[PDB]
Enzyme design. Sequence first.
Site, PDB file in Angstrom:
ATOM      1  N   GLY A  55      19.705 -47.299   7.397  1.00  0.00           N
ATOM      2  CA  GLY A  55      18.601 -47.956   8.066  1.00  0.00           C
ATOM      3  C   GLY A  55      18.162 -47.207   9.301  1.00  0.00           C
ATOM      4  O   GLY A  55      18.434 -46.015   9.452  1.00  0.00           O
ATOM      5  N   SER A  56      17.453 -47.926  10.181  1.00  0.00           N
ATOM      6  CA  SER A  56      17.028 -47.334  11.446  1.00  0.00           C
ATOM      7  C   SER A  56      18.216 -46.789  12.220  1.00  0.00           C
ATOM      8  O   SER A  56      18.078 -45.809  12.963  1.00  0.00           O
ATOM      9  CB  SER A  56      16.279 -48.369  12.284  1.00  0.00           C
ATOM     10  N   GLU A 124      37.514 -47.060  10.796  1.00  0.00           N
ATOM     11  CA  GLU A 124      38.227 -47.758   9.741  1.00  0.00           C
ATOM     12  C   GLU A 124      37.231 -48.302   8.740  1.00  0.00           C
ATOM     13  O   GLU A 124      36.198 -48.869   9.111  1.00  0.00           O
ATOM     14  CB  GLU A 124      39.044 -48.918  10.303  1.00  0.00           C
ATOM     15  CG  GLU A 124      39.909 -48.531  11.413  1.00  0.00           C
ATOM     16  CD  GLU A 124      41.277 -49.167  11.302  1.00  0.00           C
ATOM     17  OE1 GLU A 124      41.358 -50.415  11.153  1.00  0.00           O
ATOM     18  OE2 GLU A 124      42.264 -48.397  11.332  1.00  0.00           O
ATOM     19  N   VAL A 126      36.209 -51.132   6.474  1.00  0.00           N
ATOM     20  CA  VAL A 126      36.390 -52.580   6.400  1.00  0.00           C
ATOM     21  C   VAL A 126      35.847 -53.048   5.054  1.00  0.00           C
ATOM     22  O   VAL A 126      34.627 -53.198   4.871  1.00  0.00           O
ATOM     23  CB  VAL A 126      35.713 -53.284   7.579  1.00  0.00           C
ATOM     24  CG1 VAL A 126      36.134 -54.734   7.601  1.00  0.00           C
ATOM     25  CG2 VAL A 126      36.105 -52.591   8.885  1.00  0.00           C
ATOM     26  N   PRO A 127      36.714 -53.298   4.075  1.00  0.00           N
ATOM     27  CA  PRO A 127      36.244 -53.348   2.685  1.00  0.00           C
ATOM     28  C   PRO A 127      35.594 -54.655   2.265  1.00  0.00           C
ATOM     29  O   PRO A 127      34.975 -54.690   1.194  1.00  0.00           O
ATOM     30  CB  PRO A 127      37.535 -53.107   1.893  1.00  0.00           C
ATOM     31  CG  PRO A 127      38.611 -53.625   2.785  1.00  0.00           C
ATOM     32  CD  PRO A 127      38.184 -53.291   4.165  1.00  0.00           C
ATOM     33  N   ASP A 169      24.325 -58.246  20.144  1.00  0.00           N
ATOM     34  CA  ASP A 169      23.923 -57.957  18.763  1.00  0.00           C
ATOM     35  C   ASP A 169      24.660 -58.855  17.769  1.00  0.00           C
ATOM     36  O   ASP A 169      24.885 -58.464  16.623  1.00  0.00           O
ATOM     37  CB  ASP A 169      24.157 -56.460  18.457  1.00  0.00           C
ATOM     38  CG  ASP A 169      23.218 -55.867  17.389  1.00  0.00           C
ATOM     39  OD1 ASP A 169      22.272 -56.531  16.888  1.00  0.00           O
ATOM     40  OD2 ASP A 169      23.457 -54.641  17.068  1.00  0.00           O
ATOM     41  N   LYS A 171      25.341 -61.504  14.962  1.00  0.00           N
ATOM     42  CA  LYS A 171      24.737 -62.165  13.807  1.00  0.00           C
ATOM     43  C   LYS A 171      25.612 -61.881  12.592  1.00  0.00           C
ATOM     44  O   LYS A 171      26.403 -60.931  12.614  1.00  0.00           O
ATOM     45  CB  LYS A 171      23.300 -61.688  13.563  1.00  0.00           C
ATOM     46  CG  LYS A 171      23.128 -60.186  13.466  1.00  0.00           C
ATOM     47  CD  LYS A 171      21.636 -59.814  13.290  1.00  0.00           C
ATOM     48  CE  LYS A 171      21.433 -58.306  13.348  1.00  0.00           C
ATOM     49  NZ  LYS A 171      20.006 -57.863  13.248  1.00  0.00           N
ATOM     50  N   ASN A 174      26.169 -58.378  11.229  1.00  0.00           N
ATOM     51  CA  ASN A 174      26.907 -57.424  12.037  1.00  0.00           C
ATOM     52  C   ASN A 174      28.375 -57.801  12.176  1.00  0.00           C
ATOM     53  O   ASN A 174      29.044 -57.330  13.093  1.00  0.00           O
ATOM     54  CB  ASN A 174      26.255 -57.277  13.411  1.00  0.00           C
ATOM     55  CG  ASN A 174      24.867 -56.625  13.338  1.00  0.00           C
ATOM     56  OD1 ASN A 174      24.463 -56.089  12.290  1.00  0.00           O
ATOM     57  ND2 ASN A 174      24.149 -56.634  14.463  1.00  0.00           N
ATOM     58  N   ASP A 187      29.086 -52.853  15.605  1.00  0.00           N
ATOM     59  CA  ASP A 187      27.840 -52.292  16.111  1.00  0.00           C
ATOM     60  C   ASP A 187      27.729 -52.455  17.618  1.00  0.00           C
ATOM     61  O   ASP A 187      27.636 -53.581  18.125  1.00  0.00           O
ATOM     62  CB  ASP A 187      26.650 -52.967  15.438  1.00  0.00           C
ATOM     63  CG  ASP A 187      26.747 -52.907  13.938  1.00  0.00           C
ATOM     64  OD1 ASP A 187      27.501 -52.046  13.439  1.00  0.00           O
ATOM     65  OD2 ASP A 187      26.104 -53.719  13.259  1.00  0.00           O
ATOM     66  N   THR A 204      17.870 -59.963  17.925  1.00  0.00           N
ATOM     67  CA  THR A 204      17.286 -60.400  16.674  1.00  0.00           C
ATOM     68  C   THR A 204      16.674 -61.776  16.898  1.00  0.00           C
ATOM     69  O   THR A 204      17.284 -62.594  17.591  1.00  0.00           O
ATOM     70  CB  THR A 204      18.365 -60.440  15.576  1.00  0.00           C
ATOM     71  OG1 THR A 204      18.905 -59.119  15.418  1.00  0.00           O
ATOM     72  CG2 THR A 204      17.819 -60.931  14.240  1.00  0.00           C
TER      73      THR A 204
END
Lengths: 353, 18
Positions: A55-56, A124, A126-127, A169, A171, A174, A187, A204
């Site tokens: 993305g951005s 790491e 993060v699955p 940030d 949400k 994220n 993030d 957001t």
Amino acid sequence: GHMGNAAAAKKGSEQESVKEFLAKAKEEFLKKWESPSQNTAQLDHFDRIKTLGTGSFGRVMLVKHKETGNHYAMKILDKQKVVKLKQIEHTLNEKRILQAVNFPFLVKLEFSFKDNSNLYMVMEYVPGGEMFSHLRRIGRFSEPHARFYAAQIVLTFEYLHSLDLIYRDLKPENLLIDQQGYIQVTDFGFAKRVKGRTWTLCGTPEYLAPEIILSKGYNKAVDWWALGVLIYEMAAGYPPFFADQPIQIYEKIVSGKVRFPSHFSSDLKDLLRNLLQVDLTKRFGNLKNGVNDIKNHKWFATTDWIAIYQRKVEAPFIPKFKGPGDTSNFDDYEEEEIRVSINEKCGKEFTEF
Amino acid sequence: TXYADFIASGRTGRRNAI
Ligand SMILES: O=S(=O)(c1cccc2cnccc12)N1CCCNCC1
């Protein structure tokens, strides 16, 4: 009063121990903040596997370390694109934060490096994918399930705020779920060291605090507002303020009105009214007793904060995981080249990376 | 219903930063 002698003493001791932990954690953070690590691996140490996100923000790729076989999530930024989009300071600051912090719910930066064309953050893997996906799929989380996640955010914000870091940030998009069902915050492009106030319009729409919308100087209380939005959305399946267009969302946010589904417990509604409080002199997390107004609220009465921190609580949900390279909890994206130019680009701008 | 209002908003997918 609400607590007898034993309970009051235990709570007071617990709160003092938190202060003691945070003071040590700040000392460790500041050493790394002042002397950041650089250049701890290189690209040919890793096989490229699959694009996890794009993305951005650049790209994030699943990669495999050739000698250990460990998988990692490698964020790749194009230096020329970062400069074009005016994101130099955010990019440098994100990596500087990530190499300096240490907390069980903050993603770990295992390596970083750069080359002629790109910047690389090897984190790491993060699955379990984004909370967002699981929330939309299941519809909504039951209150104990939501609370388990919320408790981790409360502790993570308590940690970040003690370092004078505002997050900004939050949400479900994220927040990642790890193999044990716990949260990973990844993030940090909007995070900022802020002891007092700051003024940038960022975030957001659904998660913006009213004082950001209203172009005020604001403080870490915006993160406690966002926690309220997150808890509401986890428990309802939709956020408290939404509409076809952002301007209509902003009108709702600043209105001082919030409405709740009939299945919300009274304890939950009381917590949310105190987090989603437009009046900053009344918002939980912004009062004299700080984070303790949140941690001691009735809705968290069953929460063992130390056991959450120690990751000794059984998670409500363990994402499907069929091996260390499994990407089934992430979306599929078109695979683009990782081009590395014969010429160095924007060297001066990214000396610190 | 509020859920139907949420679907009507068209903001049920991943949300971008402003
Ligand atoms: O899932 S990511 O690609 C991702 C980022 C960082 C570390 C990661 C670790 N494991 C998986 C995915 C990861 N992602 C990109 C931005 C959107 N919000 C969530 C983080």
